[model samples]
Target: QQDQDNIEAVGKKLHEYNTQFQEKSREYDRLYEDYTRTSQEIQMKRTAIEAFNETIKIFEEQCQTQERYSKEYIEKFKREGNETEIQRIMHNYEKLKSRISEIVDSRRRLEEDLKKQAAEYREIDKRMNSIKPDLIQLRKTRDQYLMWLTQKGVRQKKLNEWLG
Candidate 1:
């Protein structure tokens, strides 16, 4: 047919569009995969932060209650002349204080890591958003070419597979 040349040229252009579309699809898949992974990490990190916060909350409350009994214990130890008990209490208090501070430091580090992951999440989102429009345009152009081929009485299962 006289119009065969035009149909072939359109198919060639559609082939180019499909190539770009395939790469975009792959890019989108990888991005989406990591996006979900980061989301899960953030959720788990937040849960850990809450868990640490609750433990610290209980610890501080207990410390407040302990102070009320601390003077009585010291006085009893002094009356009995039991220096060992007083020494052990003082050592245990220092250990708890240092351990509490270490836990807080670790919590702070987790939050800092969360901040970095949040920024990376935003970056990936923006990149995917920018990529979407180009993907839509390419897909639409390919679809239009297929519609044209159909109107011209020229269609192939191979082309539909490529479009898919």
Candidate 2:
């Protein structure tokens, strides 16, 4: 009868421990999952930053190339000074002007996109900054809880051995 009482008491303690540990474990898991999602969001923002920079650089280079060609065409006409050559150069220059307009519009659009991306990056960065401290705190809390759980397990094991 005494042995039966001891077994019952131990079983109750074990059940209580399982419930408490599971609650803590679930909280830690949720924190870990949030940290993971934050990291992924930061990574995605970084990728957008790179893409924006590359696209802007490409558009700027194209504008520079077009401007250089227009300048060269003007210089060629100045040297030739013939009606035929002037007409041809003027025609080409008009075409280049239209292209410049298109390029400027494209560059404007890209700049807008870059600006939006930068804003998004800042927002995500802020979120990461906010989450960093939380994650640190969570990690410390989890470690402390795990240590406590381990110690508790050891104590329970010793109790079981003595009781048995």
Candidate 3:
């Protein structure tokens, strides 16, 4: 009977150990799943960040090119002595100003969204650092457009004087 009791006790101890092991295994599996999910989320965020950076870079380059073209247009109007071209440039300048205003507003909205995302995710906060410089560049581009408009006005005045 004592031998039987010893065997029963050993069985119970083994059962307890098996239950604990199974529970620990399940816990490990849950943690691994969570880790994988978080890793995927971080990777997706990084990809989005890279794409956003690319878009801003392209936008800045386009704005710089536009500014250069506007300057060239003013010079061409002055040299070619075309009143019609000046009128066209003036009309186009107004359109460009409106477009630049719209772009600035869109950028402001994007910045707000990014700020919210940065607030929600600490990992994204680091990415927001790049946004400041892009915003500055955007503002600079807008100012450049305004300056171009001022130059166009000066050129138009000169043309009017020559024609008069």
Per-candidate clashes come to: 0, 0, 0
Write the candidate numbers in order of decreasing lDDT.
Answer: 1, 2, 3
Residues 49-74, model 2: lDDT tens digits = 56766765776686677678767666
Q: Sort by TM-score, best first: what order?
A: 1, 3, 2
Candidate 3 lDDT tens digits, 1-164: 58922433433443444445455545555555655565566566666666666766666686677678877667777788887887886687677566656666666666666565545455433344444455455445444443444454535443333221
| Cα TM-score per model | 0.87, 0.44, 0.46
Clashing pairs in 1: none
TM-score of predicted structure 2: 0.44
| Most TM-score-accurate candidate | 1
Residue 154, model 1, lDDT: 76
- Top lDDT model: 1
lDDT of 1: 0.84
Cα error of candidate 2 at position 162, Å: 24
- Per-residue lDDT of model 1, residues 82-101, tens digit only: 99998888788787778889
Candidate 2 runs further than 4 Å off: 1-86, 153-164
Worst 10 residues of 2 by lDDT: 155-164
lDDT score of residue 87 within candidate 3: 80
